[PDB]
Amino acid sequence: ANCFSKPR
Amino acid sequence: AKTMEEASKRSYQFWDTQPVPKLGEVVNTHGPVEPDKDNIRQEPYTLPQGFTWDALDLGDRGVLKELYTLLNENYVEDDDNMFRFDYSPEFLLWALRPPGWLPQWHCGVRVVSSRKLVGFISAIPANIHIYDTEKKMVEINFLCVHKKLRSKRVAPVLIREITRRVHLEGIFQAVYTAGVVLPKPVGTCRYWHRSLNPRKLIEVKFSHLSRNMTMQRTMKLYRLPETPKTAGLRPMETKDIPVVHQLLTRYLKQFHLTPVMSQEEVEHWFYPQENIIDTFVVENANGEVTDFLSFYTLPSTIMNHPTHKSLKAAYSFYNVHTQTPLLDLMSDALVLAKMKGFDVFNALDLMENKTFLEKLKFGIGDGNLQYYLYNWKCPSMGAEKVGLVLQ
Numbered sequence: 174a175n176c177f178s179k180p181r
Numbered sequence: 182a183k184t185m186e187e188a189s190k191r192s193y194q195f196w197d198t199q200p201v202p203k204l205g206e207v208v209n210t211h212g213p214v215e216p217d218k219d220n221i222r223q224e225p226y227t228l229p230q231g232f233t234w235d236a237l238d239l240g241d242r243g244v245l246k247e248l249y250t251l252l253n254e255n256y257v258e259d260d261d262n263m264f265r266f267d268y269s270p271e272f273l274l275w276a277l278r279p280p281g282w283l284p285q286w287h288c289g290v291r292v293v294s295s296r297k298l299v300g301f302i303s304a305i306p307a308n309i310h311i312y313d314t315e316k317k318m319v320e321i322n323f324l325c326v327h328k329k330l331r332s333k334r335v336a337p338v339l340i341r342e343i344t345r346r347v348h349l350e351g352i353f354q355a356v357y358t359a360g361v362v363l364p365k366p367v368g369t370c371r372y373w374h375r376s377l378n379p380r381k382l383i384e385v386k387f388s389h390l391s392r393n394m395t396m397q398r399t400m401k402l403y404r405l406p407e408t409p410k411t412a413g414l415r416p417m418e419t420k421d422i423p424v425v426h427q428l429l430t431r432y433l434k435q436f437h438l439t440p441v442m443s444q445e446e447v448e449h450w451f452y453p454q455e456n457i458i459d460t461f462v463v464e465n466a467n468g469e470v471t472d473f474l475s476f477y478t479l480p481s482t483i484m485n486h487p488t489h490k491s492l493k494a495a496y497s498f499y500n501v502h503t504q505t506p507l508l509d510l511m512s513d514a515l516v517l518a519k520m521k522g523f524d525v526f527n528a529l530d531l532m533e534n535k536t537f538l539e540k541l542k543f544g545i546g547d548g549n550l551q552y553y554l555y556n557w558k559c560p561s562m563g564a565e566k567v568g569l570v571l572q
């Protein structure tokens with residue numbers, strides 16, 4: 174799977 | 182387990198039984214963990230009572246719609262359950278039917294009574310170069326178990342069954358990615374995010390105002406030109422297939438984990454398809470194509486919000502430079518994404534991306550994408566040596 178990231 | 186030494190606490194009951202290096206072990210050799218099997222289990226693994234295997238014919242629009250719905254409602258979410266991937270049905274055809282795709286490798290799980298789709302895993306063939314070896318492998322993607330069927334060991338049976346179906350075709354290695362730490366990553370890459378519509382991103386809590394900044398300041402800071410600057414930029418066309426293949430192949434040689442694409446595979450992965458994959462080539466004053474950029478379309482659902490339902494994200498794919506500076510190329514990638522209506526442009530810190538991430542105002546993300554090899558023991562590598570992007 175790809176993974177969902179967002180700005181930390 | 183999303184970080185390395187909290188993965189050190191864990192025991193891995195499933196992965197300890199699989200041909201992968203142990204999380205802690207130092208690897209100095211290169212090769213398979215177990216021999217190629219000359220006798221393979223002929224019968225599918227048993228599923229719990231009331232469920233059945235079903236190979237999905239994605240050429241059937243209703244079954245493809247069933248797969249879209251399964252993933253749309255149950256696939257990957259962020260670390261706070263605010264967004265979920267929304268792979269479109271025609272994107273799924275793109276990712277799941279490249280040259281050499283096989284129908285038995287589109288492996289779904291159905292409820293016997295209702296016929297409802299509740300599980301899925303996929304394999305596609307890929308020739309992979311890893312250090313000094315080229316091996317035919319498969320890429321494993323879209324492992325999904327319905328929320329009402331979780332924590333019942335359906336994911337391990339899915340992995341074993343696709344393994345079995347790949348073994349039957351004479352392939353004994355695979356590559357895959359995941360946002361969690363498992364035994365054992367061959368490389369770790371970090372996602373970075375370049376705001377394109379910072380007000381939407383801030384409204385839906387995708388982004389947050391940086392320290393002592395205001396929404397008005399932020400909108401100015403992230404503004405971009407309205408047209409690209411690179412001379413001769415245009416969308417990729419059929420006549421560009423050979424040079425794009427030539428450009429990609431030679432550029433990838435500097436990294437240690439890369440795809441080895443045929444020209445037919447280059448056509449599939451890069452020929453532009455609206456709302457799926459965009460590829461732009463630089464054709465100079467000589468009529469020569471010298472660079473190209475590409476990014477794919479992967480929106481996400483926004484959960485629990487009354488007005489904003491979807492976030493349109495672009496993902497950096499493969500970017501080859503031989504005469505245009507990579508900073509300039511990616512700058513135009515941001516402009517083209519903005520024009521096409523994306524809210525954010527994402528990229529990993531692999532290949533040479535670290536040379537433009539900070540300078541183009543990318544903000545580092547909270548998500549790591551780990552890269553894994555199945556039945557191949559080799560030393561790990563820094564992200565700058567990973568040259569492979571999946572969907």
Ligand SMILES: CC(C)(COP(=O)(O)OP(=O)(O)OC[C@H]1O[C@@H](n2cnc3c(N)ncnc32)[C@H](O)[C@@H]1OP(=O)(O)O)[C@@H](O)C(=O)NCCC(=O)NCCS
Nearest residue numbers: 174193194195196256257325326331332333334335336359
């Ligand atoms: C990921 C998912 C399939 C796990 O399903 P599950 O059947 O409820 O998980 P189970 O409790 O039955 O067992 C999980 C086993 O499969 C492994 N596993 C979990 N996620 C995995 C992934 N993306 N890739 C490969 N293996 C995975 C686990 O490591 C575990 O093995 P372990 O004993 O060594 O830890 C399911 O939760 C899901 O669909 N999540 C959303 C989509 C997704 O894939 N998110 C990323 C998860 S990393």
Ligand SMILES: *C(=O)CCCCCCCCCCCCC
Nearest residue numbers: 174322323324353354355357555
């Ligand atoms: C994202 O969905 C990736 C999920 C990967 C699951 C583990 C796959 C392990 C390799 C299985 C195929 C082996 C073929 C020899």
